[PDB]
Design an enzyme around this catalytic site. Structure first.
Site, short mmCIF file in Angstrom:
data_model
loop_
_atom_site.label_atom_id
_atom_site.label_comp_id
_atom_site.label_asym_id
_atom_site.label_seq_id
_atom_site.Cartn_x
_atom_site.Cartn_y
_atom_site.Cartn_z
N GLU A 139 79.21 60.65 -17.63
CA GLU A 139 79.74 60.73 -16.66
C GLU A 139 79.11 60.72 -15.23
OE1 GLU A 139 83.42 60.73 -16.47
OE2 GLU A 139 83.58 60.52 -18.43
N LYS A 188 98.59 77.11 5.22
CA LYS A 188 97.56 76.16 5.34
C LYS A 188 97.00 75.86 3.95
CE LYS A 188 93.62 75.04 7.98
NZ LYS A 188 92.68 75.43 9.09
N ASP A 189 97.05 76.91 2.87
CA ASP A 189 96.57 76.31 1.73
C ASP A 189 97.31 75.78 0.74
OD1 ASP A 189 93.97 77.46 2.12
OD2 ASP A 189 94.30 79.49 1.45
N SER A 209 85.06 86.70 5.51
CA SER A 209 84.62 85.53 5.53
C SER A 209 83.62 85.25 6.94
CB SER A 209 85.65 84.39 5.62
OG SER A 209 86.67 84.78 4.52
N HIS A 237 85.07 90.37 -0.69
CA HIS A 237 86.22 91.31 0.21
C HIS A 237 85.57 92.54 0.91
CE1 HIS A 237 89.77 94.14 0.56
NE2 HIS A 237 90.43 93.08 0.64
C1 HEM Z 1 84.79 78.17 -10.41
C2 HEM Z 1 84.10 78.36 -9.41
C3 HEM Z 1 84.51 79.02 -7.93
C4 HEM Z 1 85.61 79.61 -7.50
C5 HEM Z 1 87.13 79.64 -8.16
C6 HEM Z 1 85.41 79.90 -5.98
C7 HEM Z 1 86.45 80.46 -5.48
C8 HEM Z 1 86.19 80.94 -4.04
C9 HEM Z 1 87.07 81.28 -2.96
C10 HEM Z 1 88.49 81.48 -3.38
C11 HEM Z 1 86.63 81.62 -1.87
C12 HEM Z 1 87.16 82.27 -0.57
C13 HEM Z 1 87.88 80.99 0.15
C14 HEM Z 1 86.85 80.03 0.77
O1 HEM Z 1 85.92 80.22 1.53
O2 HEM Z 1 86.76 78.86 0.11
C15 HEM Z 1 85.11 81.60 -2.24
C16 HEM Z 1 84.21 81.73 -1.19
C17 HEM Z 1 82.98 81.55 -1.60
N1 HEM Z 1 82.13 80.97 -2.47
FE1 HEM Z 1 83.09 80.08 -4.21
N2 HEM Z 1 84.09 79.65 -6.06
C18 HEM Z 1 83.43 79.01 -6.85
C19 HEM Z 1 82.35 78.76 -7.06
C20 HEM Z 1 81.19 78.98 -6.16
C21 HEM Z 1 79.88 78.45 -6.04
C22 HEM Z 1 79.26 77.28 -7.24
C23 HEM Z 1 79.23 78.92 -5.02
C24 HEM Z 1 77.69 78.47 -4.49
C25 HEM Z 1 76.73 78.35 -5.40
C26 HEM Z 1 80.03 79.77 -4.35
C27 HEM Z 1 79.89 80.42 -3.02
C28 HEM Z 1 80.72 80.90 -2.48
C29 HEM Z 1 80.43 81.74 -0.94
C30 HEM Z 1 79.16 81.68 -0.38
C31 HEM Z 1 81.74 81.97 -0.26
C32 HEM Z 1 81.91 82.47 0.98
C33 HEM Z 1 81.87 81.46 1.90
C34 HEM Z 1 82.32 82.05 3.24
O3 HEM Z 1 83.15 82.83 3.58
O4 HEM Z 1 81.86 81.40 4.35
N3 HEM Z 1 81.35 79.75 -5.05
N4 HEM Z 1 84.94 81.10 -3.51
C1 LIG Z 2 73.41 72.77 -17.10
C2 LIG Z 2 73.85 71.47 -17.78
C3 LIG Z 2 73.77 71.43 -19.17
C4 LIG Z 2 73.83 70.36 -19.81
C5 LIG Z 2 74.27 70.45 -21.29
C6 LIG Z 2 73.99 68.91 -19.15
N1 LIG Z 2 74.20 67.67 -19.87
C7 LIG Z 2 73.89 66.66 -18.97
S1 LIG Z 2 73.99 64.82 -19.37
C8 LIG Z 2 74.93 64.61 -20.98
C9 LIG Z 2 75.30 63.24 -21.61
C10 LIG Z 2 74.43 62.41 -21.65
C11 LIG Z 2 72.72 62.19 -21.83
C12 LIG Z 2 74.74 61.19 -22.06
C13 LIG Z 2 76.16 60.57 -22.11
C14 LIG Z 2 77.02 61.55 -21.85
C15 LIG Z 2 76.44 62.69 -21.49
N2 LIG Z 2 77.70 63.75 -21.19
N3 LIG Z 2 78.14 64.53 -21.93
N4 LIG Z 2 78.96 65.43 -21.60
N5 LIG Z 2 79.40 64.45 -20.18
C16 LIG Z 2 80.51 65.08 -19.33
C17 LIG Z 2 78.60 63.64 -20.14
O1 LIG Z 2 78.59 62.67 -19.22
S2 LIG Z 2 73.59 67.22 -17.36
C18 LIG Z 2 73.63 69.05 -17.87
C19 LIG Z 2 73.63 70.22 -17.12
C1 LIG Z 3 98.33 79.44 -1.37
C2 LIG Z 3 97.02 80.67 -1.65
C3 LIG Z 3 97.83 81.80 -2.23
C4 LIG Z 3 96.85 82.92 -2.25
C5 LIG Z 3 97.24 84.16 -3.00
C6 LIG Z 3 95.39 82.75 -1.81
N1 LIG Z 3 94.39 83.54 -2.22
C7 LIG Z 3 93.15 83.43 -1.53
S1 LIG Z 3 91.79 84.26 -1.94
C8 LIG Z 3 91.93 85.39 -0.35
C9 LIG Z 3 90.60 86.42 -0.05
C10 LIG Z 3 90.24 87.30 -0.93
C11 LIG Z 3 91.31 87.80 -1.85
C12 LIG Z 3 89.22 88.12 -0.51
C13 LIG Z 3 88.24 87.69 0.28
C14 LIG Z 3 88.49 86.74 1.32
C15 LIG Z 3 89.60 85.82 0.82
N2 LIG Z 3 89.67 84.82 1.85
N3 LIG Z 3 89.43 84.89 3.23
N4 LIG Z 3 89.57 83.66 3.66
N5 LIG Z 3 89.71 82.69 2.79
C16 LIG Z 3 90.08 81.45 3.05
C17 LIG Z 3 90.17 83.55 1.77
O1 LIG Z 3 90.41 82.77 0.71
S2 LIG Z 3 93.29 81.53 -1.19
C18 LIG Z 3 95.14 81.43 -1.44
C19 LIG Z 3 95.91 80.47 -1.25
#
Ligand code: HEM
Ligand code: A1D6O
Ligand code: A1D6O
Ligand code: CDL
Ligand code: PEE
Ligand code: HEC
Ligand code: HEM
Lengths: 79, 378, 62, 239, 64
Positions: B270, B226-227, B204, B200
């Site tokens: 998996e 759109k979402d 974006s 925020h």
């Molecule tokens: C449970 C996991 C996550 C949730 C719920 C989440 C949620 C969100 C949401 C709602 C946005 C704003 C909308 C969008 O651009 O799609 C966003 C943006 C972003 N997220 Fe995530 N995210 C997650 C995981 C991650 C991970 C794993 C990464 C990277 C390693 C990441 C990096 C970013 C970045 C860099 C943005 C900004 C992108 C841009 O504006 O171009 N997030 N995230």
């Molecule tokens: C960060 C992180 C942590 C953990 C702990 C991890 N572990 C795996 S592989 C585990 C596995 C094996 C070796 C054999 C059969 C089934 C499963 N297995 N267990 N859970 N699920 C969904 C599976 O596919 S990558 C990885 C990455």
């Molecule tokens: C249907 C629905 C409803 C809700 C309530 C909703 N809320 C979000 S998070 C909004 C946001 C925040 C809070 C802060 C910074 C950036 C963005 N942001 N800006 N662009 N986009 C694609 C973003 O997600 S998605 C979405 C979809």
């Protein structure tokens, strides 16, 4: 902190727009749409397709040197 | 009085979702952030239903899961929602990370580093849940991790006889696996709120890489509609899997109960853990295996300082785009190799593709961006 | 300039916005009257003579 | 340990996206369960109550639970007594404990059948090719004292005599009880036993596919209505 | 009885006699020397694959 009246400074540009109720829902769909996706695809594929063609040639060779070693041995079972 | 701007609760909602300035040229690759937030809420509500009927005891764990699919009303639809909803979470998460890598979104430094933490916490959560049903993959999946977790040099064997309750395998064993698996999704929720608080501050990024403060539009109504549309198209695909093929992504061997006596013909995790498993089995060591598994998620945090190009995104960089999809076609290779047995063709292909995953990120990408700078005269 | 029949409901009810948010409640009716004529009847037609209530007339003869 | 024979794909009548299970082939498959196996195989998770509305009525189901009396629990002025079936009983098990089961069957333990098609790589295609694929050993292989050659079993040597042949039982339908007919019916029953929600699953999938066919093209038109303001805009620059 | 009908009619196909050829070409060759580890459990599979692919296309008409 960044709201609409505080984002940039801009001079000398003009915007014209129509109401959504003054417009028809599909101006073109299939006469504009088909040649536009055919040039968006021509620009893509020579960057995206050749890595996946190399995965195909490794999958096909790798699942053909496993079957020749898991006991397809008529002439490789000699005294 | 505009009550949207003066009420203490409605102000926060208006600044975050209604009057937020957003770029006008945002693609549908920017849809997957709110899809991840839908997949997380779905896994929480469905998991809170299964936890009232599950029993964490190695004599009655497999039998309490067959009971809900046969006896409890609507237990079969809720169980297969949970197993297939977890595959839905991991496919949206890999699209999300690949988006931020192609467009250069890692330049938002505090937002990118909270994201790498969130990636570890969902991978550990999904591991604990697959132990809980106790079939023959929950057994031989748990032991492969925890004899690999005895190769930590000074505290390793201290930590392996803590998670089983102190014993080898017994009733109190899956009380600790279950309690970790209960608690971690609620910490993931708190880290995702902080994640959006740092975004925020800038707004974006957009597909061109260029700042767009002269072309903003309000978030409502243009990206609220759109979402909603993308979320309905995701609930359609998920129910095609629950109602027409609920066993397509799983393995049949987990319908046999865990037995240290019998023998499973293969060990296959998996599909979304199969790439990490292929990097493990290419290292003939057990300290250098757990190191290279943890270094394949932790290499994401070096992406801000490895950036040597003058431009932010890959839209105008044609040589960096050939390397981006060489990297995607290398994670497909490592997923296939991870589900194959360990013989001659799949042993050299597996280690020549573990080298290529680190050679592209660390060496070939920063050199290619400098060649592009020099062909444009900066 | 004879137009097509778009404005059935633009003037009377869907203008006061009352029936725009009411059509989720007032407008909840008679489509679970109308879509048994679909899904249920298509289901028993693809599977003809294979379900229980097709064949149950045999042992139900008391 | 060299190569496997994988089962071919048969055109079962429930292999469609909306195709149900044949409920007369389930009825004839329970009787091959309860006259041919039920003696070496268990089925721990299915009760008599689960067959009401599938292949039997409630009467015809009490009267089949009557046919075997069971071993109930302790009471005063008696012992753990005995009694016929109560319709809440699971299918009666066939070996006192796991250890008697080995010696009665050459050391090999016979598996539970409640999840058997779901737990095999090939489903009822594998179970069909097992029962009708018994043959003679090829010239070169030897076998143990009681051990039989089956080419569709992990490592050709199965510790299981061929349990079905022509006229092993009589159906109460007049259906000719040949070898292929009875194997087809213990693949249909044992698919129902594994997946008792099979038909309810495919009928909710059709009530979803056509109530999304109303909702999806009309959220798409609402989206296209708002965005037409931006898609038609013109821009001029006049320095 | 319907199976033995179908299984015999499809045993005279250009893939299943071509497999029977190598089978008894090697069946005769194992039994001569009595210290040999050679099987023909391989050779049986090439014939049963070719045959059982054609049984599946034709058998379920004659049942139920
Ligand atoms: C449970 C996991 C996550 C949730 C719920 C989440 C949620 C969100 C949401 C709602 C946005 C704003 C909308 C969008 O651009 O799609 C966003 C943006 C972003 N997220 Fe995530 N995210 C997650 C995981 C991650 C991970 C794993 C990464 C990277 C390693 C990441 C990096 C970013 C970045 C860099 C943005 C900004 C992108 C841009 O504006 O171009 N997030 N995230
Ligand atoms: C960060 C992180 C942590 C953990 C702990 C991890 N572990 C795996 S592989 C585990 C596995 C094996 C070796 C054999 C059969 C089934 C499963 N297995 N267990 N859970 N699920 C969904 C599976 O596919 S990558 C990885 C990455
Ligand atoms: C249907 C629905 C409803 C809700 C309530 C909703 N809320 C979000 S998070 C909004 C946001 C925040 C809070 C802060 C910074 C950036 C963005 N942001 N800006 N662009 N986009 C694609 C973003 O997600 S998605 C979405 C979809
Ligand atoms: C170039 C690469 C990117 C550069 C990284 C800088 C920005 C990223 C970042 O914030 O790092 C987080 C932080 C690292 O920064 P740091 O440890 O705070 O640095 C010390 C600063 O000198 C200490 O100075 P400070 O400014 O960080 O002090 C303020 C500090 C203190 O303020 C707070 O933490 C608020 C209190 C939160 C707890 C509330 C009570 C408990 C609930 O605020 C934070 O630490 C916020 C970050 C924590 C996010 C999660 C919040 C938990 C909820 O997290 C990590 O350890 C790993 C992720 C980043 C590692 C990348 C660095 C390369 C190795
Ligand atoms: C592990 C399992 C991974 C599962 C995911 C596998 C998915 C396969 C990807 C196949 C889809 C191909 C996308 C088609 C789009 C395409 O190629 O068109 C090119 C098109 C051109 O667009 P612009 O650059 O804006 O224009 C530039 C001017 N040239 O480029 C794009 O669309 C780029 C899209 C960015 C990527 C977004 C999603 C990333 C895709 C794959 C994710 C895989 C993960 C990779 C690493 C993640 C690690 C967790
Ligand atoms: C009197 C003995 C006996 C009868 C009757 C019998 N079986 Fe078996 N069956 C066995 C034994 C013993 C095993 C364990 C085989 C082994 O490990 O070699 C077995 C194993 C199986 C398996 C598992 C094979 C595998 O891959 O694990 C299936 C399926 C099976 N039987 C089907 C049936 C069906 C269907 C019937 C009857 C309608 C039946 N059996 C009747 C003795 C029997
Ligand atoms: C990010 C969130 C989650 C993910 C990715 C996840 C993943 C999983 C997975 C993969 C399984 C194995 C299921 C199977 O294959 O049979 C499982 C089981 C289980 N989960 Fe979750 N889970 C999540 C959240 C939760 C929560 C929050 C709870 C409880 C409050 C929960 C409760 C359970 C229970 C009780 C089981 C065992 C029952 C069963 O196996 O169906 N889960 N989880």
């Amino acid at each position: 902190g960044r709201e609409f009246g505080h984002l940039t400074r801009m001079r000398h540009v003009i915007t014209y727009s129509l109401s959504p109720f003054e417009q028809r829902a599909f101006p073109h769909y299939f006469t504009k749409g088909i040649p536009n996706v055919l040039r968006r695809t021509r620009a893509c594929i020579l960057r995206v397709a050749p890595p996946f063609v190399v995965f195909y040639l490794v999958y096909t060779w790798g699942t053909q040197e496993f079957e020749k070693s898991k006991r397809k041995n008529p002439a490789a079972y000699e005294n | 009085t505009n009550i949207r701007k003066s009420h203490p609760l409605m102000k926060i909602i208006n600044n975050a979702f209604i009057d937020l300035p957003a770029p006008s040229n945002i693609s549908s690759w920017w849809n997957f952030g709110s899809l991840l937030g839908i997949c997380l809420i779905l896994q929480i509500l469905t998991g809170l239903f299964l936890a009232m009927h599950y029993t964490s005891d190695t004599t009655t764990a497999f039998s309490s899961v067959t009971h809900i699919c046969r006896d409890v009303n609507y237990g079969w639809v809720i169980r297969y929602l949970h197993a297939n909803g977890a595959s839905m979470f991991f496919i949206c998460l890999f699209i999300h990370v690949g988006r931020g890598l192609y467009y250069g979104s890692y330049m938002f430094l505090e937002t990118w580093n909270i994201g790498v933490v969130l990636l570890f916490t969902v991978m550990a959560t999904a591991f604990m849940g697959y132990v809980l049903p106790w079939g023959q993959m929950s057994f031989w999946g748990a032991t492969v991790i925890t004899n690999l977790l005895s190769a930590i040099p000074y505290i390793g064997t201290d930590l392996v006889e803590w998670i089983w309750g102190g014993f080898s395998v017994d009733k109190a064993t899956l009380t600790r696996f279950f309690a970790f698996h209960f608690i971690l999704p609620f910490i993931i929720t708190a880290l995702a709120a902080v994640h959006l608080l740092f975004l925020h501050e800038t707004g974006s990024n957009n597909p061109t890489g260029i700042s767009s403060d002269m072309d903003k539009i309000p978030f409502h109504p243009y990206y609220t509609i759109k979402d909603i549309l993308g979320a309905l198209f995701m609930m359609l695909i998920l129910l095609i899997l629950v109602l027409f093929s609920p066993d397509l992504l799983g393995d049949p061997d987990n319908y046999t109960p865990a037995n240290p006596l019998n023998t499973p013909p293969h060990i296959k995790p998996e599909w979304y853990f199969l790439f990490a498993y292929a990097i493990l089995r290419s290292i003939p060591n057990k300290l250098g295996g757990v190191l290279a598994l943890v270094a394949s998620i932790l290499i994401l945090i070096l992406m801000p300082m490895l950036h040597t190009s003058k431009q932010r995104s890959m839209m105008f960089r044609p040589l960096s785009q050939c390397l981006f999809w060489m990297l995607v076609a290398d994670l497909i290779t490592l997923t296939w190799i991870g589900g194959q047995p360990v013989e001659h063709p799949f042993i050299i292909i597996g280690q020549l593709a573990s080298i290529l995953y680190f050679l592209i990120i660390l060496v070939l990408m920063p050199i290619t961006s400098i060649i592009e700078n020099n062909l444009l005269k900066w | 300039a004879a137009p097509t029949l778009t404005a059935r409901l633009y003037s009377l009810l869907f203008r006061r916005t009352s029936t725009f948010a009411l059509t989720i409640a007032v407008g909840a009716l008679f489509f679970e009257r109308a879509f048994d004529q679909g899904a249920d009847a298509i289901y028993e037609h693809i599977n003809q003579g294979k379900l229980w209530k097709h064949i149950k007339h045999k042992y139900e003869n008391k | 340990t060299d190569l496997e024979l994988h089962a071919p794909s048969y055109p079962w009548s429930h292999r469609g996206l909306l195709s149900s299970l044949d409920h007369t082939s389930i009825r004839r498959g329970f009787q091959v369960y309860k006259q041919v196996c039920s003696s070496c195989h268990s089925m721990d998770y299915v009760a008599y109550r689960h067959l009401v509305g599938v292949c039997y009525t409630e009467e015809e189901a009490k009267a089949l639970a009557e046919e075997v009396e069971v071993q109930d629990g302790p009471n005063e002025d008696g012992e753990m007594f005995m009694r016929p079936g109560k319709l809440s009983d699971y299918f009666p098990k066939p070996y006192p404990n796991p250890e008697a089961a080995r010696a009665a069957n050459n050391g090999a333990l016979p598996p539970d059948l409640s999840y058997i098609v779901r737990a095999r790589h090939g489903g009822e295609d594998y179970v069909f090719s097992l029962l009708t694929g018994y043959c003679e050993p090829p010239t070169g292989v030897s076998l143990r004292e009681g051990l039989y050659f089956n080419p569709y079993f992990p490592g050709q040597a199965i510790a299981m005599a061929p349990p079905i042949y022509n006229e092993v039982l009589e159906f109460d339908d007049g259906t000719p009880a040949t070898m292929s007919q009875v194997a087809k019916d213990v693949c249909t029953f044992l698919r129902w036993a594994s997946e008792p929600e099979h038909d309810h699953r495919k009928r909710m999938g059709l009530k979803m596919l056509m109530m999304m066919g109303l909702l999806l093209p009309l959220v798409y038109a609402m989206k296209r209505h708002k965005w037409s303001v931006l898609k038609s805009r013109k821009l001029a620059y006049r320095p | 009885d319907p199976l033995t009908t179908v299984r015999e009619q499809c045993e005279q196909i250009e893939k299943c006699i071509k497999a029977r050829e190598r089978l008894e070409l090697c069946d005769q060759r194992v039994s001569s020397r009595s210290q040999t580890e050679e099987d023909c459990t391989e050779e049986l599979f090439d014939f049963l694959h070719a045959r059982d692919h054609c049984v599946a296309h034709k058998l379920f008409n004659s049942l139920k």
